């Protein structure tokens, strides 16, 4: 129970290795949604309740769902399987071992310098000490989209309407 | 497409570019790039052939990958500074990520492969938009963050762009691929002086956009996309081919034409910084661009290729539509060298 | 840069074995990069064909590096002239000759002798006179 | 963490029900028994039957509507601001843009299951 | 660099107010009414100084004022207060609205036996003022001196001497 | 930096490598793009929650919606390519070499 | 260089301190070349549109000329103001930093020993 | 911005989310509000070139606040040196540190 965010992050990276080794896209999507679930859990452990539930509802139940639906239509006659290629196994194995080596090095050394400097002193350590009062600071920051973020709403809504128009232009096929 | 929908998509492309150029916040700059790409993809697929679809797909893949890398650079910068303002990057690897993303969006040499294929695969109007308007946003971001770029990375990419644009364009008979390789070389010329003087980058961009607009409008006026099709244009409208020849000479940077101004100013500004070998290399390498420009001029205006019997039909017909601002673009691309000190207005 | 630092900090015309090793390392690294790009953009028909192409490019470049280093350093120490661009010219021409041998063509060998010798002499001149390839902005 | 225990219990009991369900019965299987069911005959595999642009278009339009819904979810907390006129203007703006996307899809064929 | 200076353990000792959240909530309105002076004085110190270590004795006075407030509750109707905070304690959100009968006979105690009127809606949320003796902190941020600014532009614009001076151009 | 950040940035690097190293299917590359976006979302969320940059709490929402719009666009492109060639194989997208 | 200059208000083609410089003369050679550029644009417009290049659409060629001169006058003002600003800042910086710009001690060629190189 | 339309038209299009010391909802403070404020008040109006050297202390304190790297190093040293003396049976953590 002492370490929860680290198992979650290691599983996150494992799922990333799994779907980025690119088996047939249905198993890649399964790995992506496993990664998304554990990442939603990660941000739940950081106090990002609304953001993680957004991950769930819109990413895993929306965007993914649509991805798997579209894969179920444009696939191979025998939709492929993970095992069918030695390349998938090699990529997944290399990614898993580079995960294991670096997490072991960071755990037992705490001063790795792979591009960035890292210290696995813990993950609870960086949390600050204070009271947030009678509201969720995350929800207040996100609800400010309609009061502070007028410009953001304007450009995002315009881009979504343009996205509808754009999709209907491209898919017409003439 | 519907004329209203096409106008809206064009306006959304320009508004994404403007969002890039007017924002002080990295998230809004990323939003502008996203909006530009979203509106740009349909204008590439306006004709809708498998070539157009493949051009749009390759364009989308490169631009989306670049956008994700740009967002990662922004997030690393925020991780180390807590800053969203577009200013010097506070992290070196974030700066490297951002430089590579912006070069991939521009199509610089190590990320140049998409430019020739996409330009060939789309129509001349789409290519005109692609090689003129789409350079503004990444170059403006680069000019804003120029004080923190690694000069070695940028200069490497610019020199490679010049070399590859020169060499790749040597082998082309397709006018769109020739335009794309010329664009790669000119982007290299723009980005070489970027570490030293962003005003020179703006000047070179304006001159290049003028020349590219003139050349693409002449091609659209001619309806020619191959060198042999252009070789018939003398027997229809020789004025177009002579104007095209002077424009190609301008593109080669031959004095006293307008295309010589950016090279001359950039060489001067570089020698001001004890940079002598690189300007000499760049000027020498541009002779390749001038070589295939001169090949096009030979096939188009300076000599007369065989025509066809069916060309007599086209003689009795005028153009239904007329290219806007083409005479102005032609004069600006050839005759503006005496006005060079006005470049300080860009300061 | 450490690959180039280890070549640069050892003085000219001394410790010819060390300088030859450093130039061989630079050659092998550059050949590895060119092999990576060649394998990426013009892929082979099999893994072994790619390994063969990689080894061919790498040995050609490493042999050019080793030959340039040996000839440059030895001609420097033999003549007692470690600041003369002529030792680097001889090195570049010997590198061109071994590139011609690797491609087994006298024309490539002669052209490469001339071009690489002149290039290496220019590099020596730029080292002696402080020429900058990428000059940092100042004004 | 209570919720983690609850999820573990639910998943564990569902998998246990699988194990009893999928191992307890007595089996005797032959080739024609497990043949794919096609109302008394054999099915044709054909080649990638799940097609038609309409199934993909409804998915894409649901995706974009779901993104706008993601933009609408913070609304219960958005009404707790002192600057209520701006918030109301922006929420109604987002809903007009949702209605405009629906109307544009509607009028330009869009939502139709054509011939 | 530098030592973070810390109070000792006995600089931090105080008579604790050891009553629970429901007991605290039940008396909260009369507590705000009766204990405003040291409470607002300590909150002034905390926001003015941005330092827990600078306001310890004010917090120690906060504690004493709370303690004496509760000892005044204890000697007159500890029993109605006890019933009221018990009823408040039952509900899982410690709601006031479920305990109005008990709040009623707690409130008509302190009036008759102690004089304590209960603050109206909005009074406890007011920004008030405190007449403190503590000097106003001069540099609460411990700021360095700010950098000297670049010299401004003075003088009138004159035309460029010999013009642009760009190469051969004379204007 | 804490090791969760290490693993999140590592996930982004793995998604980038998986996208740059192509295979036959286009959908696999699009899923790698989506993984890159998801890692960006989580990194942004962790940074924003940890430093209590309250107004920046909305930034992950904007990133998610814009990246999903791009994903819809890419899905439409894949569907057009498949309707052309019956598959989403990138090797069929090579007729612009000439 | 000039982007972050103090007082430099955005999107302002001529700032108000430019009104202290002399405006360019009407017969300014650069302005006349601007008009010539407009005239060439009109001629090329006649050529491309397949009209008699010299005598067709005198109003159009005329408008080409006057619009080119109109833009050129303001371009000349902005260019001259930018160069005036450049000189202003250079003189201010030399004044504020006398140590970086010492007064060089002048010497005559009668006391300066220059090396003679024979041509022979 | 390349074209500072916001500062010409007086509009606040995206400057409100640009720093964590800007005005926040319900006045919720940023975690590094004082550090950012001090660095910004040091670096104001002297240009980035000067601000990079002359405001180095404020930016270093800000970066330490954001990513507590040196704090984490010191805590890690204390932890691992504590264990370095548990094994030898040297140091007994006190009752308030064990329960
Ligand atoms: C522009 C006008 C386009 C137009 O007629 O739209 C009609 C519009 C759309 O009609 P459509 O039939 O759907 O589309 C026809 C195609 O546009 C094809 O029609 P076409 O063959 O007449 O097109 C010629 C082509 C070639 O372009 C033109 O003929 C005119 C545009 C280029 C020259 C003027 C713009 C640049 C000026 C400054 C140059 C530097 C100084 O036009 C375009 O490519 C237009 C693209 C969209 C507009 C924005 C173009 C920006 C280019 C410059 C970027 C850099 C600027 C500086 C930074 O209909 C309306 O009712 C409006
Ligand atoms: C500083 C600002 C300078 C400009 C001030 C305003 C000038 C007039 C604005 C209207 C105008 O010229 O529109 C040109 C605008 C440009 O389109 P276009 O395809 O070049 O038109 C040429 C046709 O021959 C047009 O032939 P059209 O028969 O259709 O019409 C004749 C045309 C007369 O059209 C012209 O004269 C063509 C435009 C000439 C000047 C265009 C550029 C002006 C700015 C200078 C650019 C060069 C700067 C050089 C220096 C750069 C830095 C070194 O006049 C009008 O259509 C009425 C104008 C008043 C409304 O055309 C129209 O509005 C009519 C279509
Ligand atoms: C309506 C007129 C109203 C009126 O009474 O105006 C009086 C008005 C009174 O002005 P001013 O300042 O009292 O008197 C003139 C100064 O004494 C003398 O000038 P400034 O001291 O005031 O200085 C003007 C200034 C600034 O001037 C400029 O920036 C513009 C330069 C020309 C301005 C004057 C002519 C503009 C209008 C006619 C344009 C014709 C173009 C023909 C193109 C042919 C191409 C082969 O010049 C410079 O900074 C350097 C000048 C030399 C470099 C020129 C450009 C080099 C780069 C391009 C190389 C390509 C070849 C040369 C250029 C193209 C011509 C071959 O004078 C004029 O309008 C005429 C000025 C003639 C100056 C000529 C300078 C030599 C170069 C051009 C000669 C070759 C072209 C033929 C020009 C003459 C026949 C058209
Ligand atoms: C041929 C020889 C000459 C070549 C160049 C010819 C250029 C012709 C067009 C010049 C237009 C004005 C140039 C400057 C400009 O666009 O805006 C000036 C500007 C308008 O705003 P601006 O400065 O944002 O516009 C230019 C963009 N940057 C910032 C890169 C310079 O004038 C100002 O006073 C604004 C300064 C503060 C900006 C914030
Ligand atoms: C793990 C590295 C890759 C590997 O072992 O094999 C990959 C590949 C196999 O060869 P091939 O099938 O020709 O690849 C192109 C297929 N279209 O390998 C190749 O294509 C050649 C790679 C050669 C690498 C040599 C390194 C020294
Ligand atoms: C000079 C040295 C002596 C000549 C070169 C060595 C002898 C030789 O064999 O030369 C000819 C050489 C034969 O090799 P070949 O078969 O052509 O190469 C391909 C093999 N697969 O074929 C070659 O291509 C080698 C050429 C070597 C370089 C020749 C240089 C001399 C010719 C130009 C001299 C004049 C240059 C201008 C002088 C100043 C202006 C007047
Ligand atoms: C191999 C060629 C490039 C080598 C290189 O690193 O160039 C950088 C150089 C400055 O460093 P460098 O001279 O190499 O080392 C000693 C510095 N005191 O900068 C230089 O300009 C010296 C080397 C290149 C000299 C010109 C060579 C021909 C260019 C065309
Ligand atoms: C053509 C294909 C290869 C292009 C890329 C070559 C390598 C580019 C990356 C490394 C550049 C570098 O750092 O070079 C260092 C050296 C001297 O350093 P300098 O260029 O002056 O830059 C100092 C910045 N603080 O300068 C050099 O080494 C000069 C470049 C040598 C290229 C061979
Ligand atoms: C190189 C020169 C560099 C300086 C000038 C820059 C270029 C200016 C002109 C650009 C090209 C425009 C004409 C394009 C062309 O090739 O036209 C061909 C045409 C041939 O004859 P045609 O078409 O039958 O003539 C119809 C009636 N003009 O051609 C013609 O008819 C005439 C071609 C030359 C243009 C006319 C020149 C003299 C005009 C009278 C004097 C103008 C002086 C300026 C002030 C005018 C005031 C009204």
From Swiss-Prot, chain A:
Task: Tell me the Gene Ontology biological-process terms attached to this UniProt entry.
Answer: mitochondrial electron transport, NADH to ubiquinone; mitochondrial respiratory chain complex I assembly
GO CC, one annotated term: mitochondrial inner membrane
Q: Which GO terms describe its molecular function?
A: NADH dehydrogenase (ubiquinone) activity
- Which reactions does this protein catalyse? a ubiquinone + NADH + 5 H(+)(in) = a ubiquinol + NAD(+) + 4 H(+)(out)
Q: How does it sit in the membrane?
A: Multi-pass membrane protein
Q: List the disulfide bonds.
A: none
Q: Which UniProt keywords apply?
A: Electron transport, Membrane, Mitochondrion, Mitochondrion inner membrane, NAD, Respiratory chain, Translocase, Transmembrane, Transmembrane helix, Transport, Ubiquinone
Please indicate if the UniProt record lists Repeat as a keyword.
no
Which InterPro entries does the entry mention? ComplexI_Subunit6, NADH_UbQ/plastoQ_OxRdtase_su6, Nuo/plastoQ_OxRdtase_6_NuoJ
The text of the family note is: Belongs to the complex I subunit 6 family.
UniProt function note: Core subunit of the mitochondrial membrane respiratory chain NADH dehydrogenase (Complex I) which catalyzes electron transfer from NADH through the respiratory chain, using ubiquinone as an electron acceptor. Essential for the catalytic activity and assembly of complex I.
Q: What is the name of this protein?
A: NADH-ubiquinone oxidoreductase chain 6
> What gene makes this protein?
MT-ND6
From Swiss-Prot, chain B:
Span-the-membrane segments of this chain are 3-23, 25-45, 59-79, 89-109, 149-169, 178-198, 200-220, 237-257, 274-294, 325-345
Protein name stated in the entry = NADH-ubiquinone oxidoreductase chain 2
Q: How does it assemble?
A: Core subunit of respiratory chain NADH dehydrogenase (Complex I) which is composed of 45 different subunits. Interacts with TMEM242.
GO terms for biological process, alphabetical: mitochondrial electron transport, NADH to ubiquinone; mitochondrial respiratory chain complex I assembly; reactive oxygen species metabolic process
Q: Cite the source lineage.
A: Eukaryota, Metazoa, Chordata, Craniata, Vertebrata
Q: What's one GO-annotated cellular component?
A: respiratory chain complex I
Keyword Transmembrane helix set for record: yes
Question: For this protein, what reaction is catalysed?
Answer: a ubiquinone + NADH + 5 H(+)(in) = a ubiquinol + NAD(+) + 4 H(+)(out)
Q: Which Pfam families match?
A: NADH_dehy_S2_C, Proton_antipo_M
Q: What InterPro entries does the record tag this protein with?
A: Complex_I_Subunit_2, NADH_DH_su2_C, NADH_UbQ_OxRdtase_chain2, ND/Mrp_TM
From Swiss-Prot, chain D:
Q: What is its EC number?
A: 7.1.1.2
List keywords of the entry alphabetically.
Electron transport, Membrane, Mitochondrion, Mitochondrion inner membrane, NAD, Respiratory chain, Translocase, Transmembrane, Transmembrane helix, Transport, Ubiquinone
Topology relative to the membrane: Multi-pass membrane protein
The family annotation for this protein states: Belongs to the complex I subunit 3 family.
Q: Which GO terms describe its molecular function?
A: NADH dehydrogenase (ubiquinone) activity
- List the transmembrane segments: 3-23, 55-75, 86-106
Q: Which reaction does it catalyse?
A: a ubiquinone + NADH + 5 H(+)(in) = a ubiquinol + NAD(+) + 4 H(+)(out)
Enzyme class, first EC level, given as a word:
translocase
GO terms for biological process?
Answer: mitochondrial electron transport, NADH to ubiquinone
- GO cellular component term of the entry, any: respiratory chain complex I
Note whether Nucleotidyltransferase occurs among the keywords. no
What's the domain of life for this entry?
Eukaryota
SUBUNIT field: Core subunit of respiratory chain NADH dehydrogenase (Complex I) which is composed of 45 different subunits. Interacts with TMEM186. Interacts with TMEM242.
**Which Cys residues form disulphide pairs?**
none
Q: Which compartments is it annotated to reside in?
A: Mitochondrion inner membrane
Q: What does the UniProt record say this protein does?
A: Core subunit of the mitochondrial membrane respiratory chain NADH dehydrogenase (Complex I) which catalyzes electron transfer from NADH through the respiratory chain, using ubiquinone as an electron acceptor. Essential for the catalytic activity of complex I.
**PANTHER family the record matches:** NADH-UBIQUINONE OXIDOREDUCTASE CHAIN 3
Q: What protein name does the entry list?
A: NADH-ubiquinone oxidoreductase chain 3
UniProtKB/Swiss-Prot annotation, chain F:
Instruction: State the Gene Ontology terms under molecular function.
Output: NADH dehydrogenase (ubiquinone) activity
Location(s), subcellular: Mitochondrion inner membrane
Query: Matching Pfam families, A to Z?
Result: Oxidored_q2 (PF00420)
Q: Which residues cross the membrane?
A: 1-21, 29-49, 61-81
Q: Name one GO biological process term.
A: ATP synthesis coupled electron transport
Judged by the first EC level, this protein's enzyme class is translocase
What topology does it adopt in the membrane? Answer: Multi-pass membrane protein
Question: Which superkingdom, per the lineage?
Answer: Eukaryota
Which GO cellular component term is one of those annotated? respiratory chain complex I
**Chief place of localization:** mitochondrion
Assigned keywords, A-Z: Electron transport, Membrane, Mitochondrion, Mitochondrion inner membrane, NAD, Respiratory chain, Translocase, Transmembrane, Transmembrane helix, Transport, Ubiquinone
User: Which E.C. number(s) belong to this protein?
Assistant: 7.1.1.2
The catalytic activity, as recorded, is: a ubiquinone + NADH + 5 H(+)(in) = a ubiquinol + NAD(+) + 4 H(+)(out)
Which family would the database say this protein is a member of?
Belongs to the complex I subunit 4L family.
Its annotated function is as follows: Core subunit of the mitochondrial membrane respiratory chain NADH dehydrogenase (Complex I) which catalyzes electron transfer from NADH through the respiratory chain, using ubiquinone as an electron acceptor. Part of the enzyme membrane arm which is embedded in the lipid bilayer and involved in proton translocation.
- SUBUNIT field: Core subunit of respiratory chain NADH dehydrogenase (Complex I) which is composed of 45 different subunits.
Protein's name according to its UniProt entry: NADH-ubiquinone oxidoreductase chain 4L
């Amino acid at each position: 129970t002492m370490y929860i965010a680290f198992i979650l992050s290691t599983i996150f990276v494992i799922g990333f290795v799994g779907f980025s080794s690119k088996p047939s896209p249905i198993y890649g999507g399964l790995g992506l949604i496993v990664s998304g679930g554990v990442g939603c859990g990660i941000v739940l452990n950081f106090g990002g309740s609304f953001l993680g539930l957004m991950v769930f509802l819109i990413y895993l139940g929306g965007m993914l769902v649509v991805f798997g639906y579209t894969t179920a239509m444009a696939t191979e006659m025998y939709p492929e399987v993970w095992v069918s290629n030695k390349t998938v196994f090699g990529a997944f194995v290399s990614g898993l071992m580079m995960e294991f080596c670096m997490v072991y090095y960071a755990l037992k050394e705490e001063e790795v310098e792979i591009i960035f400097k890292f210290n696995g002193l813990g993950d609870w350590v960086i949390y600050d000490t204070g009271d947030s009062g009678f509201f969720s600071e995350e929800a207040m920051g996100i609800a400010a989209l309609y009061s502070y973020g007028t410009w953001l709403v304007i450009v995002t809504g315009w881009s979504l309407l343009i996205g509808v128009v754009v999709i209907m232009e491209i898919t017409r096929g003439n | 497409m519907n004329p209203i929908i096409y106008t809206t998509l064009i306006m959304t492309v320009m508004s994404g570019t403007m969002l890039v150029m007017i924002s002080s916040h990295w998230l809004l700059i990323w939003i502008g790039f996203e909006m530009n790409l979203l509106a740009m993809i349909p204008v590439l697929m306006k004709n809708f052939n498998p070539r157009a679809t493949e051009a749009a797909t390759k364009y989308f893949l490169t631009q989306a990958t670049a956008s994700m890398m740009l967002m990662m650079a922004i997030i690393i910068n925020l991780l180390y500074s807590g800053q969203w303002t577009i200013t010097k990057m506070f992290n070196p690897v974030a700066m490297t990520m951002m430089t590579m993303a912006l070069a991939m969006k521009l199509g610089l040499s190590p990320f140049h492969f998409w430019v020739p294929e996409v330009t060939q695969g789309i129509s001349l109007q789409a290519g005109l938009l692609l090689l003129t308007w789409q350079k503004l946003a990444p170059l403006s971001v680069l000019c804003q963050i120029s004080q923190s770029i690694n000069p070695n990375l940028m200069l490497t990419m610019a020199m490679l762009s010049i070399l590859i644009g020169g060499w790749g364009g040597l082998n082309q008979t397709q006018l769109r691929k020739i335009m794309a390789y010329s664009s790669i070389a000119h982007m290299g010329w723009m980005t070489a002086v970027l570490p030293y003087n962003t005003t020179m980058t703006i000047l070179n961009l304006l001159i290049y956009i003028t020349m590219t607009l003139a050349m693409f409008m002449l091609l659209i006026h001619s309806s020619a996309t191959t060198t042999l099709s252009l070789s018939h244009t003398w027997n229809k409208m020789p004025v177009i081919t002579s104007l095209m020849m002077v424009t190609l000479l301008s593109m080669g940077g031959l004095p006293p034409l307008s295309g010589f101004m950016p090279k001359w100013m950039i060489i001067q500004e570089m020698t001001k910084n004890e940079s002598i070998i690189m300007p000499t290399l760049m000027a020498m390498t541009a002779l390749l661009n001038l070589y295939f420009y001169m090949r096009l001029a030979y096939s188009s205006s300076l000599t007369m290729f065989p025509s066809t019997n069916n060309m007599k039909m086209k003689w009795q017909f005028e153009h239904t539509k007329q290219m806007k601002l083409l005479p102005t673009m032609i004069v600006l691309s050839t005759l503006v060298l005496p006005m060079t000190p006005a470049l300080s207005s860009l300061n | 840069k450490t690959l180039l630092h280890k070549y640069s900090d050892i003085p000219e015309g001394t410790e010819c074995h060390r300088k030859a090793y450093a130039s061989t390392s630079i050659g092998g690294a550059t050949g590895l990069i060119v092999s990576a790009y060649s394998i990426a953009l013009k892929p082979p028909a099999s893994f072994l064909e790619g390994v063969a192409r990689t080894g061919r490019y790498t040995f050609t470049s490493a042999a050019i590096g080793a030959i340039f280093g040996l000839t440059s350093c030895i001609s420097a120490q033999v003549r007692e002239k470690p600041d003369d661009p002529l030792n680097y010219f001889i090195g570049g021409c010997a590198g061109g000759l071994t590139l011609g041998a690797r491609t087994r063509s006298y024309g490539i060998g002669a052209a490469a002798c001339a071009y690489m010798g002149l290039t290496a002499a220019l590099v020596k001149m730029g080292q002696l006179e402080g020429w900058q390839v990428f000059a940092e902005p100042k004004v | 963490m209570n919720i983690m225990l609850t999820l573990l219990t639910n998943v564990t009991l569902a998998s246990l029900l699988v194990l009893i369900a999928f191992w307890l019965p007595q089996l005797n299987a032959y080739s024609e028994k497990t043949s794919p069911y096609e109302c008394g005959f054999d099915p044709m595999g054909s080649a990638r039957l799940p097609f038609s642009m309409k199934f993909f278009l409804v998915a894409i339009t649901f995706l974009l509507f779901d993104l706008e819904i993601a933009l609408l979810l913070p609304l219960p907390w958005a009404s707790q601001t002192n600057n209520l006129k701006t918030m109301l203007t922006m929420a109604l703006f987002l809903l007009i843009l949702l209605a405009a996307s629906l109307a544009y899809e509607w009028t330009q064929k869009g939502l139709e299951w054509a011939e | 660099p530098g030592i973070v200076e810390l109070p000792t353990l006995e600089d931090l000792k105080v008579q604790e107010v050891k009553v629970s959240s429901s007991v605290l909530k039940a008396a909260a309105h009369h507590y705000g009414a009766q204990c405003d002076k040291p409470n607002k004085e300590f909150m002034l110190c905390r926001w003015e100084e941005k330092d827990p270590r600078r306001c310890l004795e004010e917090g120690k006075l906060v504690n004493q004022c709370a303690l004496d407030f509760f000892r005044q509750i204890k000697r007159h109707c500890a029993e109605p207060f006890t019933e009221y905070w018990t009823c408040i304690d039952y509900s899982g959100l410690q709601l006031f609205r479920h305990c109005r009968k008990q709040q009623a006979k707690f409130d008509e105690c302190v009036l008759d036996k102690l004089g304590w009127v209960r603050p109206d809606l909005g009074e406890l949320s007011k920004v008030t003022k405190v007449k403190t003796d503590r000097p106003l902190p001069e540099n609460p941020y411990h700021s360095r001196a700010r950098p000297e600014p670049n010299p401004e532009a003075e003088g009138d614009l004159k035309p460029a001497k010999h013009g642009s001076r760009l190469f051969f151009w004379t204007m | 930096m804490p090791l969760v950040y290490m693993n999140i940035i590592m996930a982004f690097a793995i998604a980038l490598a998986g996208l740059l190293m192509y295979r036959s299917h286009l959908m696999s590359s699009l899923l790698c793009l989506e993984g890159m976006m998801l890692s960006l979302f989580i990194m942004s969320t962790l940074i924003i929650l940890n430093t209590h940059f309250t107004l920046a709490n909305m930034m992950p929402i904007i990133l998610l919606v814009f990246a999903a719009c791009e994903a819809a666009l890419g899905l439409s492109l894949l569907v057009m390519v498949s309707n052309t060639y019956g598959t989403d194989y990138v090797q069929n997208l090579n007729l612009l070499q000439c | 260089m000039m982007s972050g200059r103090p007082g430099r208000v955005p999107l302002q083609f001529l700032p108000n301190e430019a009104r202290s410089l002399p405006p360019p003369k009407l017969t300014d050679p650069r302005l006349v070349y601007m008009g010539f550029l407009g005239y060439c644009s009109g001629l090329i417009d006649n050529a491309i549109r397949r009209r008699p290049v010299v005598s067709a659409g005198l109003h159009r060629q005329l408008l080409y000329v006057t619009s080119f001169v109109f833009f050129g006058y303001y371009l000349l003002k902005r260019q001259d103001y930018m160069y005036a600003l450049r000189d202003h800042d250079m003189f201010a910086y030399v004044k504020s930093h006398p140590e970086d710009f010492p007064e060089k001690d002048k010497k005559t060629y009668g006391e300066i020993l220059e090396e003679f190189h024979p041509v022979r | 911005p390349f074209f500072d339309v916001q500062k010409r038209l007086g509009l606040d299009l995206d400057r409100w989310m640009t720093i964590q010391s800007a005005e926040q909802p319900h006045k919720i403070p940023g975690r590094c509000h004082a550090f950012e404020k001090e660095w910004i008040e040091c670096a104001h109006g002297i240009g980035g070139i000067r601000a990079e050297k002359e405001c180095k202390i404020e930016f270093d304190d800000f970066v330490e606040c954001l990513l507590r790297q040196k704090t984490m190093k010191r805590l890690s040293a204390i932890k691992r040196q504590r264990d370095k003396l548990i094994k030898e049976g040297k140091y007994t953590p006190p009752p308030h540190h064990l329960g």
